[PDB]
Design a protein around this ligand. Sequence first.
Ligand SMILES: [Zn+2]
Length: 252
Amino acid sequence: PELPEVETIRRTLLPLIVGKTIEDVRIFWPNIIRHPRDSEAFAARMIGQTVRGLERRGKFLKFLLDRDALISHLRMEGRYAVASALEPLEPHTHVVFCFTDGSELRYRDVRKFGTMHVYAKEEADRRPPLAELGPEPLSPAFSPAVLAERAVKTKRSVKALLLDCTVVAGFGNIYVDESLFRAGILPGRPAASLSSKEIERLHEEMVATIGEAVMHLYVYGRQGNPCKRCGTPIEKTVVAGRGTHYCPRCQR
DNA sequence: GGTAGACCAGG
DNA sequence: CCTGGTCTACC
Ligand SMILES: [Zn+2]
């Protein structure tokens, strides 16, 4: 899921688990657990803790318990559901948190690509994978000024910059391409080649792209199709070693 | 320190 | 062999 879908998950999942006390944690694919390294330590420390909150940082979900925070990344196919302990698990269920009321928070992931880290709450923000994560795109912490400062420093293309998670949280290939199209900027442009005007415009489009979604594509996956704003065929190349979609007319 | 890109597994 | 987000590991 993209950031906005993750936010939707955070919102709808919270009431379904808040106030629930963990009685057991069952792990069927240990590699998902990245911290503590030993999945057994992971399971044992969570038992007895009550879910108190659920926050989002970038595309990470941060489950708040009594003492610990669980940092969860769904990656490609990860999904959470709350269901009865009495019913059969759905296919590809790799982690289950069992609550004392007989319900369960289940993590499914056909790809097995998702990750989980647990730390004492007060440590979560200064350890991987949250450490160094850039500002929320919809926060005043993410500003044209912040953006401009990073652009000037680097020899990187603008796309490479926006894909950098220390720059801003939750911007993947899709939103980068879309934001760059909406800002009229070619992805292969050097980040340092962007004018202050282009920086402002880009920041604005980024925020709008994320903001609107947290509530139709122009270029992503539309190569060979007419651009929706000028009709020029959308093209696809490789920038920052990535599948990059752009309009050769709208973007400069 | 700044950077590209290596890798979680399976469709 | 391919996707990708991002933490790692290259110099
Ligand atoms: Zn166009």
